Amino acid sequence: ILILALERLREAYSTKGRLNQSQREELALIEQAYDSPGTTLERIKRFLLTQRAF
Amino acid sequence: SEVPPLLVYKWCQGINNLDKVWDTSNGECNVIIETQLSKVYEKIELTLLNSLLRLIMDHNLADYITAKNNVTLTYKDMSHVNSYGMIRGLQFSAFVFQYYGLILDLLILGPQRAAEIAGPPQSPNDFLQFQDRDTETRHPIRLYTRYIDKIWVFLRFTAEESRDLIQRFLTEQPDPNFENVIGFKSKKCWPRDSRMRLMRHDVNLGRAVFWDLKNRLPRSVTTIEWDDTFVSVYSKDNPNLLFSMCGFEVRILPKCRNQNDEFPVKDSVWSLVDNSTKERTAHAFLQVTEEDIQKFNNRIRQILMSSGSTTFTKIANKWNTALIALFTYYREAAVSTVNLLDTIVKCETKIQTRVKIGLNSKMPSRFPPAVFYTPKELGGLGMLSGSHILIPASDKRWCKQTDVGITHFRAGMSHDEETLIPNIARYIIPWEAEFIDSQRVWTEYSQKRLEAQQQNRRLTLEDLEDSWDRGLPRINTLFQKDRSTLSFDKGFRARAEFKIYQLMKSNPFWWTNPRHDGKLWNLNAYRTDVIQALGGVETILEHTLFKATGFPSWEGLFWEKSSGFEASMQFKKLTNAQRSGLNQIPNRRFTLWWSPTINRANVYVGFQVQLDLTGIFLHGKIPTLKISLIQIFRAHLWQKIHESVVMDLCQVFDQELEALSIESVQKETIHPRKSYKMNSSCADIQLFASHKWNVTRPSLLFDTKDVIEATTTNKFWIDVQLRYGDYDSHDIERYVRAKYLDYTTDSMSLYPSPTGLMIGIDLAYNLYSAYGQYFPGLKTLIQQAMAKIMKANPALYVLRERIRKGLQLYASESNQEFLNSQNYSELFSNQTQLFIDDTNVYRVTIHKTFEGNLTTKPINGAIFIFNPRTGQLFLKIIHTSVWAGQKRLGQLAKWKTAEEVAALIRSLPVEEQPKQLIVTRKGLLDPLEVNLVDFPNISIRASELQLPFQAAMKVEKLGDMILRATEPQMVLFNLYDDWLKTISSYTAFSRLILILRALHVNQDKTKLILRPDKTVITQDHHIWPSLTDEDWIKVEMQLRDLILNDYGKKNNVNVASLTTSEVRDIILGMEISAPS
Amino acid sequence: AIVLDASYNRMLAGPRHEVKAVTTKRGRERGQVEANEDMTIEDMISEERRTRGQPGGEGLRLAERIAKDARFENDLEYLEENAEWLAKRVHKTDLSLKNIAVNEYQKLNRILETCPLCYHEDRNPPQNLPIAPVISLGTRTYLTLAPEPEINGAEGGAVIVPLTHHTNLLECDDDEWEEIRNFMKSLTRLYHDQGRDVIFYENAAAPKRRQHAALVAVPIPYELGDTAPAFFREAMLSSDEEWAQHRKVIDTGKKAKEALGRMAFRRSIAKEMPYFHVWFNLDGGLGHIVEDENKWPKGDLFAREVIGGMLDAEPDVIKKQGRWTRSDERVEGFKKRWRKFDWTRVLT
Amino acid sequence: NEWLDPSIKKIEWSREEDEKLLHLAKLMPTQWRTIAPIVGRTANQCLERYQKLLDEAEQREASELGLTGPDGGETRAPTAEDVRKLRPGEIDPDPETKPARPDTIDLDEDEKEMLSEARARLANTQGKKAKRKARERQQEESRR
RNA sequence: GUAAAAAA
């Protein structure tokens, strides 16, 4: 499920020449989620349990 | 499960397979109402949404979703809190809306009819089918679908039900004054007889059904609007059934209502078959809606507006994606719709106009469809077409220069048929064929797998070869990479439909998924037929600049990618205009490549100009072409080419005074700019006759009919005229004849003499021809001379290298001609050539340690240098002391070898410096070439021949002195012994190759054959034993058949089947494909 | 400073006869140059010889001219009127050119030292051996294992790697390639005795990273060893730019069967292009020119994805890049399995 | 917006404020950006106070029941803020709502450069043409 | 560097 989600966000970045700061940090977050899938899953489930203001 | 065309197809099939649907005997009517749920996302209430999501899922997930919808939206200096309505840009918004819309579907249908349409929970219905026929016919609502927020309802009304419903509607809203027709809706795209003027009862039934559904929906949540709604009624008076779904106008006509006995069979009409009685009971006509024609036109408008500043290739790619998505979506509806095809023609014209304006600000008369539609592999833009473009045979004309001369072909003149650019509408399979073919291909693949596991074998590509680009989804999708994640990927179509709210970049392929559906189109046949319709690759490359770049074959041509100046150079903080120019450098590449066909008078009619320092005529202002041509012919390259050609021809004349009985050869130097003077000409080379010669009539160089006139003459000229021919004018024979006749019969030209010959050179196409008088010797001498010149002139080498660097082309190892059989024969001319071998230099040997480990301990090597014209063998011995303490050892072995070869060339005097070098390894070219930058008159090339200087190392004395070497050394040996005095150098080199390949293939049998008698003694200053001529040819034959037998037993090929040239090729070191 | 020859900067090769010192005061003191528009055979040929292989090329030089031009308008009238000055090239000062040379030296030294596959005779043991534990070492190539984790069902994979830190096995030498073919034959025989087919691949898809060119041998079972060209065909048809400049799949096996022999791969692809190639035979296979650096997978992810797709694997095991270690038990086990087929052993 | 705006009350919540917060959180559930202007505090303040009130009432329920023994052992279950106390390698999601951390004795180099550039940027007021006119006034004065 | 006598 997580790999499908990250592939969707990365293909939202697929054809991009110039990247701004939020674009580069979202690419970095995606590759961190690729490298540590378990930690990302715990963080995601913690956010889904706890966060109500965004 | 399905793509939106398959959804439309299934909706047509469901309508056709309803009970008695076309029966209007008892007054029953059918209604399709399509409408849109107005302001649903806007009117979602977040507390109620939290309650409904709490129903279907965990409360933490529901609370996350609604809290996520309650956010602050910002745009520049504006901000507000969204506290009412959903945000469609959240990732889960498509899911949340499909659930909310399901609740709205329950409101529209009622729970009981929704349960009947959905079927029982354990065995749910298929799409548009029911459990049984009474459940189908219980209720007036027969078919229902919601696509996000568009809904379609198909109702079937008896006369009594229709009367009750119209009675209630007119009780609520009474209006007799006949404006329900003047305010109703109908399809103005179909024919008038496919429609008609409306009727009171059908109109009242339509507005009454709309009224009933609007009464079902509560306005605070959502409503449906009459301006959003289209209604169609099929009755006894209206035998037609109209609806739009996802882009398709669909008109259904029953076969029991059609007024013709027979039907014109169309590739564009769906034949709706009854699923019980199995005959075609209805026809469905499809068109594209005008809204979608507008959407495609707006997509091309968006391309043009954002693409005033980008490349021709990106413009072409965007056009290609738009067109292929349009045609692969609509298929039959596209070729049915007449306004769509006109829009495609106009949009294609606009795209080509964009490329034309970006090339030159003034509109031309005719670019070739070659330059627009040639595939990207041949340097074209690779555009597809949805129009019909005539390809003229004036574009299809092409010529070829061989040693005989010039051959002209007019391809297409086999037939009078109009060659057209092909149409992807003809290359894409219709949707109905796709659905039937999908059924049959998946059944076929399942069976083929069944026999594969029955006979317990492997599936082969020959099994899964015919059933390859077929199906929905594709067998290709069975062979894509990820399949587990694909099994877990759900909701992707709805996800894309909401991806328009997360991304600015619109997807023309929004309707299909390559990961799930697979690629639903293929253009290999299209591209081959485009090449054939353009007239073949030879015709295309006649249009281009392929002749001037000096490449052997168009296969193996590679184009370097040139786009990364964004990441590369934006650190310079460029201006908007600056980075637009950097974004359009790929346009100079395209313009240079297609240059011979653009600046033509027929293309750009007008007042031609002349490029400074050249003889190029520029037709209109093409600034990137002008810049590139200045970068090519900079440093007076036109006049310097003329000077180098004249110098080479005068060198040939200087060495052939005695051959042609020429008293002296004069080199006129008064005119430095006559080369690119084009109004008239003077002469370049002067010939003074020692004896009175009889010259021929004026004729071309390659004409074989020499009519020697009786007029005696003494004074001759040779006049070299350069040219840069466009595609309209690159017939160098006609050019040289016409300019020769004019410059002789025109009195402002002052030739120094009344006899002469004019040689003209077309630089843009690498051509040449001559016209004038000939005393004997000129034809053969100038033939050999000009062949060697245009294969050997260094100014022309500079020109070819500049064109290669300006196109950024690379080539495979079908590269510049290495050593082969022909230049193997051509070694033995007067030029000083020299072989360089370095494979024996850096030698390492595997030594076993006391631990059992392996050490790559280096030993000495020897740079081998071989003059074959004199049989000289220089050896440069390099030591382990040199190899000590270095990293990247093989690389610096090559670089050292280049360094000491350059040192030896430096030590050599001018008279003893070689003209040509040939390296055995092809890796030495870069280090040797850059270290011989200082000696650029040396021509350096590589060898495709694998000569056995390994065996030359394997000779006893040389290997012994290499082993006994302590310091670096430099020694010289002789390899021809006395064969220079006995036989020819050709035969001596052949014998040397024979003995060295014999030593390559074995050592004991080789030395036994070389020394069959102990009376034969090898003396001191010779390397090989002294034999007679008959003994030497006997040893030659023995080593020849020894090598042939070893090759036969190694490759399992019979010896007697090889020809003499083939046996020579094995003796040389070449590789030959098997004759069997 | 410290040698820095033409091998380290090809523009540091003799006199620059294409340049000309600027007559102005700043051209005297800063050290700008210009174009030597009176030049001959010698000068032009020397210039092209020195300027082949430059990054970017003539496109980058025109880009530098535009980036200098402050009055530049992207307009055809402007380009035509300023055509001469725009066409005029720009030549770097010798100080900046030495800066380029020392920069590539520092980058190349860092890459060469950090590369886990190079073998040099300079640094002392145990650092003389590479990080990859050598099993069989020919005269100029050798063989180690694929790093952990491997794709399940394809365990025991090897890599054939030359001593010379190339970027392409088109850059590799003739004898390097010959003993690479011998390694391929030996591994093919080993895996056929194992009962499995073998495929080989070279990932030259990122030549700007200057990785050590290695040929990975992956063993696969029999039926998917038959169907492997379909998987690689589909992946290379789907994983790159749709409107590609070249053919998406070039069939070196088909060219070899037609007539190129062994030399189909080395005579079919230009060495200056980024590519991926897979061998199923010993003389052929099929390959792809990587034209979209963003759309192509990063690193060896392309081949890992394809191999996992055949051998259905955990995607974590797929996108976990391999990491090399020096002491490795399964390398010892693969050596004690390998020592039968070793032609380097029968040579020694 | 969440800390430094001068309309943000960082004093302790009154009883009327707590009653309003609970009443609105019952009315418009999990809609904190909507609730916060009516209460008068920020959305993060309202959310953190609401979960603190719920945890306080949970602890008073546990104390009233007396499930645990004496308050001198290690058998107490951790609080919600204890579970939400960060993992080793966990990022704060709302450091803009957390209060400011005081300056250390020794600043780091990024902070010295940050202070220097702050001073220069605050002092600067002119554009490029105004600066060249001042420079050329001085140069013309000296030349004259 | 193209458009006025231990801080390109």
Ligand SMILES: [Zn+2]
């Ligand atoms: Zn390395």
